[PDB]
RNA sequence: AUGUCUAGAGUCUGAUAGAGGAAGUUAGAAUUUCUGGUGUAAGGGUGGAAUCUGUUGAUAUCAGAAAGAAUACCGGAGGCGAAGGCGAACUUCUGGGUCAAGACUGACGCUGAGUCACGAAAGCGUAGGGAGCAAACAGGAUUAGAUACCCUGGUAGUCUACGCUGUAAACGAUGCACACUUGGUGUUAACUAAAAGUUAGUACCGAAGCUAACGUGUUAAGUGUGCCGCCUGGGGAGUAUG
């Protein structure tokens, strides 16, 4: 099967649905996927996400958010760390994505947290993805 | 317009007088696009015609 | 493709094969 | 493995030779262990391409059951019957079921 | 059957191959009541001259009384007892034990095995090893050991690996393709044995050295250009001539293509189409 | 062929119950039976190459299952190889 | 073996018109001109390739002309 | 490191399509040769000729016999296989795929350096076979010349069994696997009585996107990653040497 990304699969599905301009997208469900979508939700990139059922398997249905002119909120969403190339960073060397206009998402000792929260709590970890 | 599909009976060399209508007047098989038969039936029909020809039920060429 | 490059390769191959044929049977 | 075979045979024209040939064919199946032998006469037709100088012959259909391994040997013996012009043996039909 | 090769531990073994005798009921001595000791021939005749050259002293061998004429044992089944090596011919010999107690030798066909039951006569089944008159054998079979005159025995094909092909039958005669390749007519009442003759690797052997050729009873062959003109028409080799003459036998008979069969032989009626070069 | 009867027979022997087809022991045993009759078939028909490819795919599957089983349940693995004759 | 039985009162002209038509409907002459001399299976396949491509371009062409009009 | 789950992947059950492979049998058309009739001066061939064949009876036509190789029609915007490839008919042996609530195992998977297996055609070794076709080669023509294109012949080879060689424009010039991303028109198989739709393939056109352009476009060359192979100006050169 070599899924190789419970993370990149959802990222790619979300990216594709967002650019074609769908209303909702329907992802596999995991603790990290939930955490990431939660961070998106606070940051105002997605409207909401719900938990569901199909054939006894749980899904996450995410409500894509666009402006009134159908320009997506997500512009570019892309992975940094990667099974063949794992990228870790200290809390000082954390990149500020696009001069802060975007957000960085990392996995740290205290859970999956945004870059600003990682800086404010003085913790660092794996660089999951960058969204702007 | 597949006659075998319409009649519900399936190609068989024993039923050779019926087979004789899908043969030209000296043995050559007719194309699907002419006889208007279905593909699966056409394959089975060709096989049965070959079997009959092996049993002299049907002619290779008329003499 | 223009095919001049393929022609170049062809004549090279012919010359190499001719060399080998010439030096066959020699010992 | 017992398999339900179905076969067609051609015999030369006259009736006594037809019957005799069919009889050794039947006993041949019985020797090779055939079970559930059933026949069906088709008739006496004029062949439309000559076979072994003949032009007219009688057709028989036999639907029997028999294990796989003896088909080889059975076949090797059916070549000995003088009056069996041509024949073929088939596995069962692709019945619509 | 099979071929057994040798590692080159001497300069002679490099291309020596012999048969493998796996298809032979081994460890065998011949039946004492059927074999007699005999001289080695060497090609001299009653007058004492050499009539055939270049035949000499090979390995001493006994003679096994074969039976190519199974006619006086029709309808009587027999058992195959063993398959044995025969030094007097290429093919192997099978020892048949008859139901009445008589034992006999036959040429061993290809594919028979110990314990088989063999039968001879018009009523015998068409099975490898049975002997039947050509009447009864169906067109399209392969036979061997063909009889030429009723009561004579099998005088046609007999050597290892050979077989004859029945082509057609007509009147008193059957058309048979022989191993040389000609098509000959045979009288329909003579007998024949069904199936090919076993031991078909016999001639795939590479002898290996001059010594084995001497074992087989074959003295050396002296060419004609090595002679003097008194000895052979080709002699005179003052510096490697080629005869200086169209090739001939040592007695002046031409040898490259000359046809030596008599032009008006008695059997010319029975030969359809001769062999091919 | 491995007929339905020996298929079910081996299932009954090697599984915990009559419905336990999918367990690893049943898997390996069935594939071993297939391998045996295929090596018999391919001993005769030496120029059959599609069958040889099928045989090799089966052998690879058996090795994969054997590694998974040996890593997970070791003593069952040694019992199984000893019972089936698969050398180690 | 294509035959045309000539009736007692039937005219030779239409008789061989029938012959010509059923010959053409058996495609004997085209088969013979095909078997005159050998062709690589490669070149049979390639000529069929090209013939179908020509047919497709011609059909697209024809429909373009029909809609252009 | 030790467990748990089933949605991935497998086993079992049922259904089903197919030139998938190997072995053993059989068939007819056509061609060539041979034999026997009828019959006479041409046949054959080209842009045009000639070589050649034929008065020792050609070609043409009728009948019979023999051998070899290949399987018209079905037959295609098909089908199957990993690829090469696989099409007269039958049996035996045997590989793979697809669908489903239809239960079982519970991550058992993806890719894969060496290695191993297979691998069109040509070629090689051993032993057969040899109709037709046909390198080399011969003759006749074209030409200044023709070691060619054309014509008449013709040996290997083409075929079979076994053992080697492991190369192709071996191509979709596009490695494999998974998760996603508007449609139009056909077609194959299955589920459904059938339409009608779905699923798994297989073709054409085409939106967005991508592309240096050509083009590609749910069978991506689109958006992502896993692993392997490979490239770093041309000639020298896939040469020299090992
Ligand atoms: Zn139909």
Cβ neighbours of G13 (radius 10 Å): 8
The method of structure determination was: cryo-EM
CA angle E150, E153, E157 (to 5 degrees): 115
Helix (H) and strand (E) counts for chain E? 1, 15
Mutate: best of D7, D8, D43, D93, partner B, most B CBs <10 A: D8
Q: What are phi and psi of D3, to 5 degrees?
A: -130, 140
Nearest nucleotide (C1') to alpha carbon of E168:
H65
Which residue from G minimizes the CA distance to B61?
A: G1
Contact positions of strand H to protein Cβ (< 7 A): 6-29, 65-67, 72-78, 81-83, 87-96, 101, 103-111, 117-119, 126-127, 129, 133, 162-163, 169, 173, 177-182, 187-190, 204, 222-227, 235-240
Distance CA E33, CA F46 (A): 46
Name the protein residue, with chain letter, whose CA is nearest the C1' of H104: F22
DSSP characters over chain A: -----HHHHHHHHHHHHHHHT-SEEEEE--HHHHHHHHHHHHHTSEEEEEE--BTTB-EEEEEE-B-TTS-BS---EEE--BTTB--EE-SSS---GGGGTSEEEEEETTEEEEHHHHHHTT--EEEEEEE-
Residue E269 (CA) to nucleotide H36 (C1'), in angstroms, measures 18
Nearest-CA distance E138 → chain D (Å): 8
Nearest nucleotide (C1') to alpha carbon of F25:
H105
DSSP characters over C1-27: --SHHHHHHHHHHHHHHHHHHHHTT--
Tokens for G44, please give them.
Answer: 């049979």
Residue B52 (CA) to nucleotide H126 (C1'), in angstroms, measures 44
Span from the CA of B42 to the centroid of ligand 1 (angstroms) = 8
Residue B13 (CA) to nucleotide H194 (C1'), in angstroms, measures 27
Span from the CA of D45 to the centroid of ligand 1 (angstroms) = 28
Location of structure tokens 């094909």: E157
Which residue from D minimizes the CA distance to E127?
A: D77
Count how many Cα atoms sit within 13 Å of the Cα of residue D29 in the half-sphere of its side chain.
Answer: 21
Which residue from D minimizes the CA distance to E126?
A: D80
Mutate: best of E111, E123, E124, E126, partner D, most D CBs <10 A: E126
> Are chains G and A in contact at 3+ CB pairs closer than 8 Å?
no
Span from the CA of B50 to the centroid of ligand 1 (angstroms) = 18
Using CA atoms, how far residue E156 sits from A2, D56, E91, F59, G50, in Å, is 74, 41, 14, 55, 63
Span from the CA of A57 to the centroid of ligand 1 (angstroms) = 44
Cβ neighbours of G6 (radius 10 Å): 14
Span from the CA of B37 to the centroid of ligand 1 (angstroms) = 6
Cβ separation of G22 and B25 shorter than 8 Å? Answer: yes
Cβ neighbours of B11 (radius 10 Å): 21
Q: Are strands E131-133 and E117-118 parallel, antiparallel or unpaired?
A: unpaired
Q: Is G36 helix (H, G, I), strand (E, B) or coil?
A: coil
Asked if residues B46 and B29 have their Cβ atoms less than 8 Å apart, the reply is yes
Nearest nucleotide (C1') to alpha carbon of D89:
H90
**E-state strands within B1-63:** none
Enclosing H/E stretch for G38: none
Q: Number of CB pairs < 8 Å for B and D?
A: 32
Experimental resolution (Å): 2.9
Which residue from B minimizes the CA distance to D41?
A: B14
Distance CA A64, CA E115 (A): 87
């Amino acid at each position: 099967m070599a899924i190789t990304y419970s993370i990149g699969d959802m990222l790619t599905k979300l990216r594709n649905a967002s650019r074609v301009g769908h209303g909702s997208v329907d992802l596999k469900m995991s603790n990290m996927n939930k955490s990431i979508l939660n961070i998106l939700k606070e940051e105002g990139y997605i409207k909401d996400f719900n938990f569901l059922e199909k054939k006894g398997i749980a899904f996450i249905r995410v409500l894509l958010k666009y402006d009134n002119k159908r320009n997506p909120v997500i512009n570019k969403i892309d992975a940094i760390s990667t099974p063949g190339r794992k990228i870790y960073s200290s809390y000082r060397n954390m990149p500020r994505i696009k001069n802060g206009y975007g957000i960085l998402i990392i996995s740290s000792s205290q859970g999956v947290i945004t870059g600003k929260e990682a800086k404010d709590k003085k913790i660092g970890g794996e660089l999951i993805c960058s969204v702007w | 317009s597949c006659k075998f599909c319409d009649s519900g009976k399936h190609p068989d060399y024993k039923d050779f007088d019926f087979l004789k209508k899908f043969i030209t007047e000296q043995g050559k098989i007719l194309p699907k696009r002419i006889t208007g038969t279905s593909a699966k039936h056409q394959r089975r029909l060709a096989l049965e015609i070959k079997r009959a020809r092996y049993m002299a039920l049907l002619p290779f060429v008329k003499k | 493709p223009c095919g001049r490059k393929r022609k170049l390769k062809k004549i090279s191959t012919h010359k190499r094969k001719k060399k080998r044929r010439k030096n066959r049977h020699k010992k | 493995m017992i398999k339900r075979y179905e076969a067609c045979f051609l015999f030369k024209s006259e009736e006594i030779e037809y019957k005799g040939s069919l009889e050794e064919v039947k006993k041949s199946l019985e020797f090779f262990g055939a079970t559930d032998v059933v026949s069906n006469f088709i008739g006496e037709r004029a062949l439309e391409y000559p076979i072994k100088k003949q032009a007219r012959g009688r057709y028989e259909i036999i639907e029997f059951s028999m294990e796989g391994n003896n088909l080889k040997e059975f076949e090797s013996r059916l070549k000995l019957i003088r009056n069996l012009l041509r024949y073929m043996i088939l596995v069962k039909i692709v019945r619509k079921i | 059957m099979g071929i057994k090769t040798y590692k080159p531990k001497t300069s002679s073994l490099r291309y020596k191959t012999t048969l493998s005798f796996d298809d032979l009921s081994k460890g065998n001595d011949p039946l004492k009541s059927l074999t007699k000791g005999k001289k080695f021939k060497s090609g001299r005749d009653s007058s004492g001259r050499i009539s055939i050259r270049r035949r000499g002293g090979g390995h001493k061998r006994k003679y096994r009384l074969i039976d190519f004429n199974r006619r006086d044992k029709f309808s009587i089944p027999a058992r195959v007892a063993s398959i044995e090596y025969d030094p007097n011919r290429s093919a192997n010999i099978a020892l048949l034990v008859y139901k009445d107690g008589e034992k006999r030798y036959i040429i061993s066909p290809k594919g028979i095995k110990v314990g088989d039951v063999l039968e001879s006569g018009p009523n015998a089944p068409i099975k490898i090893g049975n002997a039947l008159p050509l009447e009864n054998i169906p067109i399209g079979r392969t036979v061997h050991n063909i009889e030429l005159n009723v009561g004579k025995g099998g005088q046609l094909i007999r050597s290892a690996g050979g077989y004859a092909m029945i082509l057609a039958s007509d009147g008193n005669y059957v058309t048979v393709k022989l191993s040389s390749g000609e098509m000959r007519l045979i009288f329909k009442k003579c007998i024949a044995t069904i199936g090919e003759i076993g031991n078909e690797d016999y001639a795939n052997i590479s002898i290996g050295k001059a010594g084995k050729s001497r074992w087989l009873g074959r003295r050396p062959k002296v060419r004609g250009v090595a002679m003097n003109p008194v000895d052979h028409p080709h002699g005179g080799g003052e510096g490697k001539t080629s005869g200086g003459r169209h090739p001939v036998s040592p007695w002046g008979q031409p040898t490259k293509g000359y046809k030596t069969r008599k032009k008006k032989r008695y059997s010319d009626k029975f030969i359809i189409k001769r062999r091919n070069k | 062929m491995i007929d339905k009867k020996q298929k079910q027979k081996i299932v009954s022997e090697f599984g915990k119950n009559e419905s336990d087809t999918g367990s690893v022991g049943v898997q390996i045993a069935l594939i071993t039976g297939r391998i045996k009759y295929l090596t018999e078939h391919l001993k005769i028909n030496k120029k059959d190459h599609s069958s040889k490819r099928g045989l090799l795919k089966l052998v690879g599957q058996r090795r994969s299952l054997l590694r998974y089983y040996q890593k997970k349940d070791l003593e069952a693995y040694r019992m199984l190889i000893s019972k089936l004759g698969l050398r180690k | 073996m294509v035959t045309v039985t000539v009736d007692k009162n039937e005219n030779l002209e239409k008789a061989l018109k029938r012959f010509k038509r059923m010959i053409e409907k058996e495609a004997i002459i085209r088969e013979w001109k095909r078997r005159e001399y050998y062709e690589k299976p490669s070149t049979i396949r390639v000529k069929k390739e090209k013939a179908f491509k020509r047919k497709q371009a011609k059909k697209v062409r024809k429909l373009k002309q029909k809609t252009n009009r």
